[PDB]
Amino acid sequence: QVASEYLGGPGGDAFDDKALAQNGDITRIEMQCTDVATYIKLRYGKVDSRQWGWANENCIQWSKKGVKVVHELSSGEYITSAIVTYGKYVQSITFKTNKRTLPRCGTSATEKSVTVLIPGGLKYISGRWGCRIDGLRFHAKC
Amino acid sequence: QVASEYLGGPGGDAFDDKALAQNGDITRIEMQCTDVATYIKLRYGKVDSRQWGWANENCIQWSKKGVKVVHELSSGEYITSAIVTYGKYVQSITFKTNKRTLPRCGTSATEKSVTVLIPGGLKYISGRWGCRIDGLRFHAKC
Numbered sequence: 181q182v183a184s185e186y187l188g189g190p191g192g193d194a195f196d197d198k199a200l201a202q203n204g205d206i207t208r209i210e211m212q213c214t215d216v217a218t219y220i221k222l223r224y225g226k227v228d229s230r231q232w233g234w235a236n237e238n239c240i241q242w243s244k245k246g247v248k249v250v251h252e253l254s255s256g257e258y259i260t261s262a263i264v265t266y267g268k269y270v271q272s273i274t275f276k277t278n279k280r281t282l283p284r285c286g287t288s289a290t291e292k293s294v295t296v297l298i299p300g301g302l303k304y305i306s307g308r309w310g311c312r313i314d315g316l317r318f319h320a321k322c
Numbered sequence: 323q324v325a326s327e328y329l330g331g332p333g334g335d336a337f338d339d340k341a342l343a344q345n346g347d348i349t350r351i352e353m354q355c356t357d358v359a360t361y362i363k364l365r366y367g368k369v370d371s372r373q374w375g376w377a378n379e380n381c382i383q384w385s386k387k388g389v390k391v392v393h394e395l396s397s398g399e400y401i402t403s404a405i406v407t408y409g410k411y412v413q414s415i416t417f418k419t420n421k422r423t424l425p426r427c428g429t430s431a432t433e434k435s436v437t438v439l440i441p442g443g444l445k446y447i448s449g450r451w452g453c454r455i456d457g458l459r460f461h462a463k464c
């Protein structure tokens with residue numbers, strides 16, 4: 181059960197998709213994307229997680245909201261790396277799969293950048309959330 | 323298994339430790355170090371690789387040489403992060419493990435930098451080499 185280091189800060193509430201991933205492979209990525217990433221929501225098999233971020237509409241006081249971005253993954257498509265910029269919060273996320281690169285969620289990439297290899301493909305994510313994505317951790321199929 | 327991008331230039335000869343890595347986890351890191359890193363040589367279990375770099379002593383016409391730096395990894399110690407600065411060649415390499423940060427090899431770190439995180443630990447390296455380290459690629463365990 182390999183896992184990256186936790187990337188981000190201590191705010192928000194803890195979430196962990198571990199149990200949900202027992203449905204199977206990640207089949208879908210949903211995020212909300214502006215100058216930063218404001219939520220992430222993965223689908224394991226047929227089942228979506230909760231919306232991890234943009235806890236409520238009044239969050240518009242502390243950041244932009246953004247556009248709902250979906251990447252449906254095809255059979256046998258696995259997320260094998262992520263470029264993450266982060267500090268107190270997750271700022272931007274760029275996923276790469278064994279089949280294609282995907283656009284960055286979060287047009288600003290000015291904070292500390294890190295390229296995370298995800299051995300075996302991404303199995304699931306954990307992290308912390310509130311108005312946005314306080315932090316992420318990548319759990320690998322390894 | 324999952325691997326990073328190739329970091330560096332097109333010169334030298336390709337090398338690949340994949341087959342050697344079947345002999346075990348990385349137990350030792352040897353590099354030659356001046357203002358830049360001029361070779362790298364890992365040990366996989368008890369099996370040493372060839373010296374990847376500093377092909378011969380007249381390489382001194384094209385860069386400084388540097389000193390031999392050896393770091394032995396303890397049992398259960400693995401490389402979780404590599405900061406590489408590079409351009410036409412690899413310039414500097416800073417390894418971090420799950421137990422410590424090792425000193426940078428290559429005192430100059432002015433070239434383009436990338437921090438590669440490897441959850442579960444680096445399994446092996448590949449790349450290109452001649453008088454120095456033309457390029458490096460990092461391979462995870464799955």
Ligand SMILES: OC[C@H]1O[C@H](O[C@H]2O[C@H](CO)[C@@H](O)[C@H](O)[C@H]2O)[C@H](O)[C@@H](O)[C@@H]1O
Binds near residue numbers: 242309314
């Ligand atoms: O509701 C008041 C606060 O809203 C935000 O704080 C929430 O969301 C943050 C980012 O996800 C979390 O770090 C934090 O713990 C949550 O309370 C806003 O960022 C705060 O500045 C507001 O005080």
Ligand SMILES: OC[C@H]1O[C@H](O[C@H]2O[C@H](CO)[C@@H](O)[C@H](O)[C@H]2O)[C@H](O)[C@@H](O)[C@@H]1O
Binds near residue numbers: 335384451452455456
């Ligand atoms: O053999 C003379 C050459 O030495 C150097 O080139 C070798 O090492 C380089 C760096 O590792 C490689 O890029 C190159 O492929 C090798 O031939 C030097 O860089 C050359 O100028 C010399 O001709």
